[PDB]
Design a protein around this motif. Structure first.
Motif, PDB file in Angstrom:
ATOM      1  N   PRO A   1     -14.520   8.531  23.213  1.00  0.00           N
ATOM      2  CA  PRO A   1     -15.129   8.205  21.917  1.00  0.00           C
ATOM      3  C   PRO A   1     -14.212   7.359  21.027  1.00  0.00           C
ATOM      4  O   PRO A   1     -13.240   7.878  20.474  1.00  0.00           O
ATOM      5  CB  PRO A   1     -15.380   9.584  21.293  1.00  0.00           C
ATOM      6  N   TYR A   2     -14.520   6.071  20.898  1.00  0.00           N
ATOM      7  CA  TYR A   2     -13.714   5.180  20.073  1.00  0.00           C
ATOM      8  C   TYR A   2     -14.030   5.400  18.602  1.00  0.00           C
ATOM      9  O   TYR A   2     -15.199   5.484  18.214  1.00  0.00           O
ATOM     10  CB  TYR A   2     -13.963   3.721  20.447  1.00  0.00           C
ATOM     11  N   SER A   3     -12.987   5.469  17.782  1.00  0.00           N
ATOM     12  CA  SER A   3     -13.142   5.742  16.359  1.00  0.00           C
ATOM     13  C   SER A   3     -13.393   4.494  15.528  1.00  0.00           C
ATOM     14  O   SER A   3     -13.856   4.610  14.388  1.00  0.00           O
ATOM     15  CB  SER A   3     -11.893   6.448  15.825  1.00  0.00           C
ATOM     16  N   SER A   4     -13.108   3.313  16.063  1.00  0.00           N
ATOM     17  CA  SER A   4     -13.068   2.095  15.270  1.00  0.00           C
ATOM     18  C   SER A   4     -13.415   0.919  16.171  1.00  0.00           C
ATOM     19  O   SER A   4     -13.248   1.000  17.393  1.00  0.00           O
ATOM     20  CB  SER A   4     -11.684   1.914  14.629  1.00  0.00           C
ATOM     21  N   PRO A   5     -13.929  -0.174  15.607  1.00  0.00           N
ATOM     22  CA  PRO A   5     -14.192  -1.373  16.412  1.00  0.00           C
ATOM     23  C   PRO A   5     -12.906  -1.936  16.989  1.00  0.00           C
ATOM     24  O   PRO A   5     -11.818  -1.713  16.434  1.00  0.00           O
ATOM     25  CB  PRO A   5     -14.821  -2.345  15.401  1.00  0.00           C
ATOM     26  N   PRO A   6     -12.983  -2.668  18.101  1.00  0.00           N
ATOM     27  CA  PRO A   6     -11.769  -3.257  18.688  1.00  0.00           C
ATOM     28  C   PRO A   6     -11.043  -4.139  17.682  1.00  0.00           C
ATOM     29  O   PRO A   6     -11.656  -4.963  17.001  1.00  0.00           O
ATOM     30  CB  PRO A   6     -12.307  -4.076  19.868  1.00  0.00           C
ATOM     31  N   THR A   7      -9.722  -3.952  17.598  1.00  0.00           N
ATOM     32  CA  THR A   7      -8.908  -4.751  16.683  1.00  0.00           C
ATOM     33  C   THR A   7      -8.994  -6.236  17.006  1.00  0.00           C
ATOM     34  O   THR A   7      -8.989  -7.077  16.099  1.00  0.00           O
ATOM     35  CB  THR A   7      -7.448  -4.295  16.737  1.00  0.00           C
ATOM     36  N   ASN A   8      -9.062  -6.584  18.287  1.00  0.00           N
ATOM     37  CA  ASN A   8      -9.028  -7.982  18.690  1.00  0.00           C
ATOM     38  C   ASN A   8      -9.620  -8.112  20.088  1.00  0.00           C
ATOM     39  O   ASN A   8     -10.029  -7.124  20.705  1.00  0.00           O
ATOM     40  CB  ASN A   8      -7.601  -8.530  18.648  1.00  0.00           C
ATOM     41  N   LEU A   9      -9.632  -9.354  20.587  1.00  0.00           N
ATOM     42  CA  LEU A   9     -10.223  -9.646  21.892  1.00  0.00           C
ATOM     43  C   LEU A   9      -9.558  -8.847  23.003  1.00  0.00           C
ATOM     44  O   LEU A   9     -10.237  -8.341  23.903  1.00  0.00           O
ATOM     45  CB  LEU A   9     -10.128 -11.140  22.182  1.00  0.00           C
ATOM     46  N   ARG A  10      -8.228  -8.718  22.962  1.00  0.00           N
ATOM     47  CA  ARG A  10      -7.542  -7.943  23.990  1.00  0.00           C
ATOM     48  C   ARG A  10      -8.039  -6.499  24.009  1.00  0.00           C
ATOM     49  O   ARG A  10      -8.281  -5.931  25.080  1.00  0.00           O
ATOM     50  CB  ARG A  10      -6.028  -8.005  23.765  1.00  0.00           C
ATOM     51  N   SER A  11      -8.210  -5.895  22.829  1.00  0.00           N
ATOM     52  CA  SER A  11      -8.734  -4.536  22.759  1.00  0.00           C
ATOM     53  C   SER A  11     -10.180  -4.474  23.236  1.00  0.00           C
ATOM     54  O   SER A  11     -10.587  -3.495  23.873  1.00  0.00           O
ATOM     55  CB  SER A  11      -8.624  -4.006  21.330  1.00  0.00           C
ATOM     56  N   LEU A  12     -10.975  -5.496  22.912  1.00  0.00           N
ATOM     57  CA  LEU A  12     -12.356  -5.534  23.378  1.00  0.00           C
ATOM     58  C   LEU A  12     -12.412  -5.512  24.899  1.00  0.00           C
ATOM     59  O   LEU A  12     -13.166  -4.731  25.493  1.00  0.00           O
ATOM     60  CB  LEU A  12     -13.061  -6.777  22.832  1.00  0.00           C
ATOM     61  N   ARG A  13     -11.592  -6.342  25.545  1.00  0.00           N
ATOM     62  CA  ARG A  13     -11.610  -6.422  27.003  1.00  0.00           C
ATOM     63  C   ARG A  13     -11.091  -5.142  27.644  1.00  0.00           C
ATOM     64  O   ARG A  13     -11.589  -4.727  28.696  1.00  0.00           O
ATOM     65  CB  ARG A  13     -10.798  -7.626  27.468  1.00  0.00           C
ATOM     66  N   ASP A  14     -10.087  -4.505  27.040  1.00  0.00           N
ATOM     67  CA  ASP A  14      -9.596  -3.253  27.604  1.00  0.00           C
ATOM     68  C   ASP A  14     -10.654  -2.162  27.528  1.00  0.00           C
ATOM     69  O   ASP A  14     -10.791  -1.352  28.453  1.00  0.00           O
ATOM     70  CB  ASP A  14      -8.326  -2.809  26.882  1.00  0.00           C
ATOM     71  N   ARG A  15     -11.414  -2.118  26.432  1.00  0.00           N
ATOM     72  CA  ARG A  15     -12.489  -1.138  26.347  1.00  0.00           C
ATOM     73  C   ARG A  15     -13.598  -1.466  27.338  1.00  0.00           C
ATOM     74  O   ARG A  15     -14.108  -0.570  28.021  1.00  0.00           O
ATOM     75  CB  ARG A  15     -13.023  -1.070  24.915  1.00  0.00           C
ATOM     76  N   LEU A  16     -13.963  -2.748  27.444  1.00  0.00           N
ATOM     77  CA  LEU A  16     -14.943  -3.167  28.443  1.00  0.00           C
ATOM     78  C   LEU A  16     -14.497  -2.782  29.849  1.00  0.00           C
ATOM     79  O   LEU A  16     -15.302  -2.308  30.659  1.00  0.00           O
ATOM     80  CB  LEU A  16     -15.170  -4.678  28.350  1.00  0.00           C
ATOM     81  N   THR A  17     -13.211  -2.974  30.155  1.00  0.00           N
ATOM     82  CA  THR A  17     -12.687  -2.561  31.455  1.00  0.00           C
ATOM     83  C   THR A  17     -12.871  -1.064  31.674  1.00  0.00           C
ATOM     84  O   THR A  17     -13.309  -0.630  32.746  1.00  0.00           O
ATOM     85  CB  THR A  17     -11.214  -2.944  31.569  1.00  0.00           C
ATOM     86  N   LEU A  30     -20.579  -6.512  32.949  1.00  0.00           N
ATOM     87  CA  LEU A  30     -20.674  -5.868  31.641  1.00  0.00           C
ATOM     88  C   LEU A  30     -20.253  -6.824  30.541  1.00  0.00           C
ATOM     89  O   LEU A  30     -20.864  -6.850  29.462  1.00  0.00           O
ATOM     90  CB  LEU A  30     -19.812  -4.605  31.601  1.00  0.00           C
ATOM     91  N   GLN A  31     -19.206  -7.614  30.788  1.00  0.00           N
ATOM     92  CA  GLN A  31     -18.766  -8.567  29.777  1.00  0.00           C
ATOM     93  C   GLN A  31     -19.846  -9.598  29.498  1.00  0.00           C
ATOM     94  O   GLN A  31     -20.101  -9.938  28.335  1.00  0.00           O
ATOM     95  CB  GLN A  31     -17.469  -9.257  30.205  1.00  0.00           C
ATOM     96  N   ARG A  32     -20.492 -10.111  30.549  1.00  0.00           N
ATOM     97  CA  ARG A  32     -21.591 -11.042  30.338  1.00  0.00           C
ATOM     98  C   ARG A  32     -22.736 -10.368  29.588  1.00  0.00           C
ATOM     99  O   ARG A  32     -23.371 -10.985  28.729  1.00  0.00           O
ATOM    100  CB  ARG A  32     -22.071 -11.609  31.676  1.00  0.00           C
ATOM    101  N   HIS A  33     -23.022  -9.106  29.918  1.00  0.00           N
ATOM    102  CA  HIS A  33     -24.078  -8.369  29.225  1.00  0.00           C
ATOM    103  C   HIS A  33     -23.789  -8.273  27.734  1.00  0.00           C
ATOM    104  O   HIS A  33     -24.661  -8.540  26.900  1.00  0.00           O
ATOM    105  CB  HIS A  33     -24.218  -6.981  29.847  1.00  0.00           C
ATOM    106  N   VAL A  34     -22.555  -7.918  27.385  1.00  0.00           N
ATOM    107  CA  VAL A  34     -22.168  -7.851  25.976  1.00  0.00           C
ATOM    108  C   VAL A  34     -22.316  -9.215  25.305  1.00  0.00           C
ATOM    109  O   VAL A  34     -22.831  -9.315  24.185  1.00  0.00           O
ATOM    110  CB  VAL A  34     -20.734  -7.301  25.854  1.00  0.00           C
ATOM    111  N   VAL A 166     -18.090   0.544  23.279  1.00  0.00           N
ATOM    112  CA  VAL A 166     -16.768  -0.011  23.019  1.00  0.00           C
ATOM    113  C   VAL A 166     -16.429   0.036  21.531  1.00  0.00           C
ATOM    114  O   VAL A 166     -15.569  -0.712  21.072  1.00  0.00           O
ATOM    115  CB  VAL A 166     -16.624  -1.437  23.579  1.00  0.00           C
ATOM    116  N   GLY A 167     -17.111   0.891  20.771  1.00  0.00           N
ATOM    117  CA  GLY A 167     -16.773   1.111  19.378  1.00  0.00           C
ATOM    118  C   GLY A 167     -17.433   0.199  18.368  1.00  0.00           C
ATOM    119  O   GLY A 167     -16.977   0.151  17.221  1.00  0.00           O
TER     120      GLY A 167
END
Length: 288
Positions: A1-17, A30-34, A166-167
Motif C-alpha cells: 500500500p503506497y502512501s503517496s504518489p511517486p516522487t519522480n519517474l524513477r519511483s514510478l517505474r520501480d512501482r510499476l516493476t 503494464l507500463q504501456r497500459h498506464v 502505484v499510488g
C-alpha cells in the motif's frame, strides 16, 4: 500500500516493476497500459457544452479495458472516434496534455491524415509524448476517426486500477465505443478486400471478434445487427453479411495474435477462428 504518489519517474517505474511482478504481467505491457490510461484521462476531459464526451476509445485499448491485460491482445495504438470535432480534437488534446493530469503531461506531434476508403473524412494519426513530473515517460500512437452512423450515440464507461496500484488514486473513467459498433467495424475490417498493392493482414481481428462475442454473453444481437448493417451500408464496399475468408499468409499472423492467451478458450487455428467468426456473423444476421 503506497502512501503517496511517486516522487519522480524513477519511483514510478520501480512501482510499476513491483506491481507487474505481483500481477504476473510483463513490465512493458503494464507500463504501456498506464501510458494509455493517462492519454485516456486527457481524452476524457474533452467534452461538448453539455458535458458529453468528445472522444470515445475503441480498438485494442478498449478491449484491454474491457477484458484486462491478461485476457486481451497486446497492442500499441490508442484508437478513438471523435464524436463531434474535426481538427479541434488535436488542439484540445494538446491543451489537456499541457495542463496535465496527476503529474503526467503530454506533447502531441502534428496530425497526419490517413487515406481510408468508405470514410468521407479521413482518420488522423499522431503521437503523444508523455512525461511524468518533467521527465519523458512513454510515447503513445493515437488514431482519431470520425463518427460513422450511430457509433457515437452511446458509450460504455470503463476503468482500470493500474494507477491506483502505484499510488495515484484519482478515479479513472474512460468513455468507450459500445460493443455492437466494435463488432461491426472489426467484421468490416477483417472481411475487407484491399487494392492490389495493399493486402489485408488483419487476422488479429479474428481474435478480437471472439473476445467481443464472449463479452456479449446472452445479449440480444439486434443492436449488433443494426450496427453491422449501418457500417456496411455507410462504407458502401462489400455487402452485409460478409464471408470470413482467410488469406494464405494469415496462419502465423493469427498465431502471433494468440500470444499470451493460452488460458482462454479460443480457436487455436486460423481456420477454426474463421469458422467461429462466420458462425457469429450468421447469428447476428438471424437476429430480429
Amino acid at each position: 500500500p503506497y502512501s503517496s504518489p511517486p516522487t519522480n519517474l524513477r519511483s514510478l517505474r520501480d512501482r510499476l516493476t513491483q506491481v507487474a511482478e505481483r500481477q504476473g504481467v510483463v513490465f512493458g505491457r503494464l507500463q504501456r497500459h498506464v501510458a494509455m490510461i493517462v492519454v485516456a484521462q486527457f481524452a476524457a476531459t474533452l467534452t461538448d457544452d453539455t458535458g458529453a464526451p468528445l472522444l470515445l476509445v475503441k480498438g485494442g485499448s478498449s478491449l484491454e479495458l474491457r477484458r484486462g491485460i491478461p485476457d486481451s491482445r497486446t497492442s500499441k495504438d490508442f484508437d478513438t472516434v471523435a464524436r463531434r470535432d474535426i481538427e479541434l480534437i488535436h488542439e484540445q488534446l494538446a491543451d489537456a496534455g499541457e495542463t496535465g493530469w496527476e503529474g503526467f503531461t503530454a506533447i502531441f506531434t502534428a496530425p497526419e491524415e490517413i487515406d481510408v476508403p468508405g470514410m468521407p473524412v479521413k482518420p488522423r494519426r499522431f503521437t503523444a509524448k508523455l512525461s511524468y513530473r518533467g521527465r519523458a515517460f512513454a510515447t503513445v500512437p493515437i488514431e482519431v476517426s470520425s463518427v460513422e452512423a450511430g457509433n457515437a450515440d452511446q458509450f460504455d464507461t470503463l476503468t482500470s486500477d493500474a494507477l491506483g496500484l502505484v499510488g495515484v488514486p484519482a478515479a479513472v473513467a474512460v468513455p468507450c465505443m459500445t460493443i455492437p459498433w466494435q463488432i461491426a467495424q472489426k467484421l468490416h475490417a477483417v472481411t475487407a478486400v484491399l487494392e492490389e498493392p495493399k493486402v489485408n493482414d488483419r487476422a488479429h481481428d479474428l481474435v478480437d471478434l471472439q473476445l467481443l462475442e464472449g463479452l456479449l454473453l446472452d445479449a440480444d444481437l439486434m443492436p449488433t445487427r443494426s450496427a453491422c448493417i449501418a457500417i456496411f451500408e455507410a462504407r458502401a464496399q462489400h455487402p452485409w453479411p460478409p464471408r470470413v475468408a482467410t488469406l494464405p499468409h494469415w496462419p502465423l499472423i493469427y498465431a502471433g495474435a494468440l500470444e499470451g492467451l493460452d488460458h482462454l478458450e479460443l480457436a487455436r487455428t486460423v481456420d477454426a477462428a474463421a469458422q467461429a467468426v462466420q458462425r457469429f456473423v450468421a447469428r447476428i444476421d438471424r437476429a430480429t
